[PDB]
Structures are given as C-alpha cells and as structure tokens.
Design a protein around this ligand. Sequence first.
Ligand SMILES: NC(=O)c1ccc[n+]([C@@H]2O[C@H](COP(=O)([O-])OP(=O)(O)OC[C@H]3O[C@@H](n4cnc5c(N)ncnc54)[C@H](OP(=O)(O)O)[C@@H]3O)[C@@H](O)[C@H]2O)c1
Ligand SMILES: NC(=O)c1ccc[n+]([C@@H]2O[C@H](COP(=O)([O-])OP(=O)(O)OC[C@H]3O[C@@H](n4cnc5c(N)ncnc54)[C@H](OP(=O)(O)O)[C@@H]3O)[C@@H](O)[C@H]2O)c1
Ligand SMILES: COc1cc(/C=C/C=O)ccc1O
Lengths: 346, 352
Amino acid sequence: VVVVNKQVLLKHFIPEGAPKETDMELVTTGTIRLRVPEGSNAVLLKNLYLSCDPYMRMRMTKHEEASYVDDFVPGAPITGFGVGKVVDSSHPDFKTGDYVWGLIGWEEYSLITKPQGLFKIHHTEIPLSYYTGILGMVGLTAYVGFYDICSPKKGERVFVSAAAGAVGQIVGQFAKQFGCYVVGSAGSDEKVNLLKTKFGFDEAFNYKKEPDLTKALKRYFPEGIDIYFENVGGPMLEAVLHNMRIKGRIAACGMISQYNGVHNLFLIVGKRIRLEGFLVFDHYGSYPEFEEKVVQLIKEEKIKYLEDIVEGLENAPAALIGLFEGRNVGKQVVVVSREKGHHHHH
Amino acid sequence: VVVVNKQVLLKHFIPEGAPKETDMELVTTGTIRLRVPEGSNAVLLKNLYLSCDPYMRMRMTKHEEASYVDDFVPGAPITGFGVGKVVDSSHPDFKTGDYVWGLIGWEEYSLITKPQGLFKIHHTEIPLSYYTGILGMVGLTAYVGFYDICSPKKGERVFVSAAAGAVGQIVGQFAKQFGCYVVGSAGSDEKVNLLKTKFGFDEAFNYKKEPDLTKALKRYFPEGIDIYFENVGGPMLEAVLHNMRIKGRIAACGMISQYNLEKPEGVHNLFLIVGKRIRLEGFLVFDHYGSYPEFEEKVVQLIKEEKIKYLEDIVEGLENAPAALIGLFEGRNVGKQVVVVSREKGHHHHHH
Ligand SMILES: NC(=O)c1ccc[n+]([C@@H]2O[C@H](COP(=O)([O-])OP(=O)(O)OC[C@H]3O[C@@H](n4cnc5c(N)ncnc54)[C@H](OP(=O)(O)O)[C@@H]3O)[C@@H](O)[C@H]2O)c1
Ligand SMILES: NC(=O)c1ccc[n+]([C@@H]2O[C@H](COP(=O)([O-])OP(=O)(O)OC[C@H]3O[C@@H](n4cnc5c(N)ncnc54)[C@H](OP(=O)(O)O)[C@@H]3O)[C@@H](O)[C@H]2O)c1
Ligand SMILES: COc1cc(/C=C/C=O)ccc1O
C-alpha cells in the first residue's frame, strides 16, 4: 500500500524582514509507504490539522548558534504543531487509530522517529482541531503565562496586546474569570468588537487608529496597569510602562512587533516592576491539569473560542503568511484532511 | 539657648540635565533652638554625617504625578540619608545621647516631626559613618537585591556594574562569598584594581576603555552571564542582555547612566528576554525595612570579623556637600560618598 504524499517545503532561507508565500513551495509527485520500517521505533501519522503559529517565522532564517528551536531546512518540509492519526506504530505508547498532537510535517503523512514529543488525545468528543490551539501549545501558553508568570490577584487591572490573537483571546478570558479588569488591543475594528461582544473584554481598542498609545492606555486605565500580558513589545511596551502601577508584572510571551527600542526601562526600578520572558517549551509538566481545566470550561461553555480555518494543504503557505499580516480572525488552522464522520459550521 | 545652623538649600527646580553646584546654596545666618517645641512629639538631632546618594538628583526636578519620593522644595534645605545624635526629644523611644539614622536635613541640626522613620543605632562601637552606607539604606539594598531579587545559586556567573560603588562593592562580596563567579565594571583603573585586590572580585574591567561592551563581557563570560546586578542602565544593559544565559536574572537596582539625560538611551534587544526566559526585576529598598534585623545581624558580624571590606570616600564639612553630590555623576567618588558635618564628641580614630 503506497500513497501520494503532498509536501510543503522551505524553498530557501530568507534575510531579515518579512516572509512571503513564495518562500514556500508545494510538491505533489512524492509518495510514501503506509507502514513503519521493521525494527524502527516510530509512529506513522496521517496528518489531519495544522496550526500556523507566529514563532514559525523565526525558523525560516539561518542561525549560526542554536536559538531555542532549530531552523527549517531548504528542500525539507515545513514542520510545526498539528494533529494526526496513527496509521501504524512500532513505538509502544501509540496504537493504530490513536489521535495525537505535536510537531509534525507540512504534508499528508509523517513518519515521526522521535515519538516522545507527541501527546495522545484523550478527549475525542472535542473537535480535534482544538489540539492545534486552545487545547494545544497556544492554550498552554495562555495558561502558564497568566496563572504562573503574572501572579494575578482578584481585582487587578490586566492589559493584553494582540488580544484578538489566539493566546491573547484565551488570556483575556482566564483573566476576566479570575475577577480581573481586562482590556485588549488589536489591529481591526472587527476584532475590537469581538473582544467586547464575543470574548467579554471590558474594553478594547484598535492600536492603528491611536496616534498616542500612552494616552490611549490612560483612557482605559485611569489608575494604571497591574499586569501586562505582552505579545507585541516595542513602543507598545514603552506606553505600558508609562502606565504601569507599583509592583506591576509583565509576562513577555512574545514581541511580534519585532519579528518582521524602549527608552523608559528605568521606570521598572521605581515602580518595582517584574518583567519576565517565558517559553511554553519548559512547562509541559502542567499540561494534564491544564487540559482538564480547559476541557471543563468548554463542556461548561464558560470559555469562547474562535478558529480561522483554511481547507487543504495547498492553502497553508498563504494562511501562514496572512498570520504575519494579522489577516487571521481567530487561531489560524489548516485542515490537511478531515477524519471521517461527526460538528457543523457556517 | 540658641545656636548657628548652617544649611544647604535647593535654590531652584532644575530641568532634565546634569545638576550643578549652583543649584544649591549655603546659608549660614540661620539659627535653631536646642529644645523641641513644647507639646510636640519630636526629636531634634545634631547631624554628624550625610550620605550622597544618586536618587537625590531626581528630587531636584518638579514632578506633577507622585513618585516613590517627594520632590525637594526650592528654598527648603536639601534632605537625604544621614546619622545624627539626639540633642532633645519629646518622643518616648528616643532619648538624649541616642544616635540614629534616617532621612535628615542637609544642615547642622534637624527637627524631625516624624521620628517614627528613624532607626536607633544599637552598635555604637562601629564607626558611625557606616550607618550612612554599609549599615544604612545602601547596605540593605545590596542585601535585598542580591539575596532576594537575584535568586543566586553556588557557581553562578555574576556581573555587577558600578561595581566599585557603595552598592556594587557590597554585592560583589556577598556574591563572592556565596560561591559565585564575580566580575565588575568601574569607570577607572584605580577602581578596577580596588575591585581585584581589596574586594576580591574575580575579574574587573574599565568600561570607559572598551570600544565594545558586548565583546568585553564575552571575554569575561565565555559561558555567558547568570545574574546581572544592574546599577547602570543604557548600552551596558544591552551588552549584558546579549551575553546572558538561559533563565538569567537582572536585578534593576538603578540606572545611573540615565539620571542626567534629557533623552534616555533606547534598549533594543529586550526580545532576548523571551527566548532566554529572563527575569528583569526592579526593586526599592524602602519597601524592605522589614529585612533590616536579619541583615544587620549578618553584616555587623561580617564587619566585626573583617570578612567584608568597605571603602568610604569622605569629604569634610557640610559646605562640600553640593560638590560631592555632583561628583557622583562623574564618578569622582572612590567608595561610598560621605560628608562629615560634625564629628561626634569622643572619636580617637586615625586615618590617612
Ligand atoms: N513564549 C512562548 O512560549 C509562546 C508560545 C506560543 C505563542 N507565543 C507568542 O504569543 C503571541 C501571540 O500568539 P498567537 O499564536 O495567539 O498569535 P495570533 O494572534 O494567532 O497571530 C498573530 C497576531 O499578532 C498581531 N500582529 C501581527 N503583526 C503585528 C505588528 N506588526 N504589530 C502589532 N501586532 C501585530 C495580529 O493581530 P492584531 O490584529 O491584534 O494586530 C495577528 O493576528 C506571539 O507574540 C507569539 O510569539 C509565545
Ligand atoms: N533601588 C534602590 O533601592 C536603590 C538604593 C540605593 C541605590 N540605588 C542605585 O544603585 C546604584 C549604585 O548606587 P551607589 O549609592 O552605590 O552609588 P556609587 O556607585 O557609590 O556612586 C555612583 C557611581 O556610578 C558610576 N557612574 C556615574 N555616572 C555613570 C554613567 N554615566 N555611566 C556609567 N556609570 C556611571 C560612577 O562610577 P564609575 O567610576 O564606575 O563611573 C559613580 O562613582 C545607583 O544607580 C543608585 O541609583 C538603588
Ligand atoms: C531613583 O531610583 C532610585 C532610588 C534609590 C533609593 C531607593 C530606596 O529604596 C536609589 C537610587 C535610585 O536610582
């Protein structure tokens, strides 16, 4: 049994600046046998869904010394988080018909030879695509960032940049449900309005239509900010610092403003601010409890979640690109292949 | 019974910029009564020593929104940290002959109406001047920032800037004795040699003499920096950031390179904070007076056992205080800057 296997490859490395669709290429002639090798310690996956995540951009650029994650290889498939089904296994922990999530290939089928970086999916009542984000890497990020790095108290005043992004939207809800005052910022009036209507943010604003970020935060935060969940960085951070309260905390998840400086750092001393970067890579020990908490929320309908869904691998390169441009409304997902039988969608 | 009471006053609020002598004025006509007001709850001090501290400059500028500390008032005496003797008292916890340290006037005698924010000195055997730095506010800063903010572990690689100053020279010794590798920067060869010889730092470097701070740190930290005790701010900070290890910590104690700039340096590589999982944490010694006792016990014993070294830079007479404060931002001070206002009755102590 030998089948077609479409692939998406890094065409070439790219310099400083912005990725483009043409940095990738779809190849359709390749094939793959539908068993694992004898004597292997591997899992063969039919790839169902793929996440486009902002961090992927970094991996298109060549690094002499190892950044946290290895660079993509020219002529080799793009990889990143996704969800898959075991077509075959020669590793004990995974059986034919199991569903998993983790780093897989941007292709129809992945022979994973490092199976220990996969996680079996225990709730199949939930749409599998959620394990690309809310129940995946993205949710875990929100969860660790917020509960751990921000040390929040019932009553504190929370600001979240890229609030309409996948992490941001989950942070915002965790925080409102913690008894916090929550304000997010975004790139669209469409998204500002989702933050308030769908996601239950107390206020929200479009950063692009604000000529003074510092005064912008002032209107929303008359007594200052306690907790900045930071996805953006740059002049946004300057403005947050200006507006931060005694003993404020900044969780430095990302600085997306910087992928494709700050002048008032000294305010950290006299306001006794804690600024701390964190990486969800270091925190997989918290997954299982994180999983049960967020599963309960969904079943209970105490959390809302929006996915931006694209259909088919060949659509993956533009979706990834749109992500960088803020074209995604909700967590960007690509459907490589839907598993058979069932939700409904509009 | 009335005496002469010299005072240094703030003449005018100043703009963003460097301060100058002529921002303060000496006034020698003033007089003071040597008994607290009747019906008061107060302590009159004869002031013996004053500390020159960098945060003092910020107070010379008007601020519309309150900071941690209140501005100076023009035409009112400058105030800061010092050491005084109780001359008279209508407050029970303070008696005549008691020596104290706290916030006092830049003057010969101060009538303290909030005696609650005074510390009585229990160890009069140690030179009183130490309670302006090592056993005062400054010593506690080193203690809290290093032992608490830095979360150090044996073997860690520690970088301290303004390492030959009041705070840094102490932090380095804490760090050395904690079992850490310790490197400092200072603004001269004199300082550098002090760091290596007197203070036991593993390495030191004259930062004014490095064309590349990033590469300078790379020389001393071939495996990178675990902990950085931030006294300085500015491009040293970025150079540290580039050189910092995974899970590195930065205790933002102060950023003195910035205090006299109308326009502050931008730091450009904060992003590293993410992939290196760094904590950059500011703190204020004012919120930590709770720690004093454990700290005082620990440090008085170190001093008594000569297990910690300490250099003061002494300037004689209240009159030389303005120039001494100004000298801090050019790094004239070599050790902790102290001004001797009036040296207590009873010293029989030699120096060079
Ligand atoms: N540290 C970790 O372990 C970890 C793990 C996962 C994710 N993250 C980080 O969390 C952040 C958001 O993640 P996500 O997956 O939830 O992303 P996302 O929101 O699904 O997508 C990126 C969003 O960022 C905003 N954006 C794009 N370019 C921008 C610019 N130049 N200036 C300001 N905003 C811009 C856009 O929204 P607007 O319409 O709001 O502009 C866009 O929708 C990223 O910084 C990412 O690197 C960190
Ligand atoms: N957060 C708190 O609670 C707290 C409490 C006390 C002190 N502090 C801070 O801790 C730091 C150290 O204070 P200290 O009392 O120990 O002062 P200090 O080091 O005894 O005196 C100041 C020294 O800073 C250095 N310096 C001056 N201008 C500089 C510049 N433009 N660039 C680089 N270095 C410069 C000079 O030494 P060089 O010869 O090396 O240039 C100068 O001798 C200060 O930044 C102060 O604000 C904070
Ligand atoms: C201006 O910020 C500072 C405050 C202090 C004193 C802090 C006491 O808790 C010292 C140096 C500074 O730069």
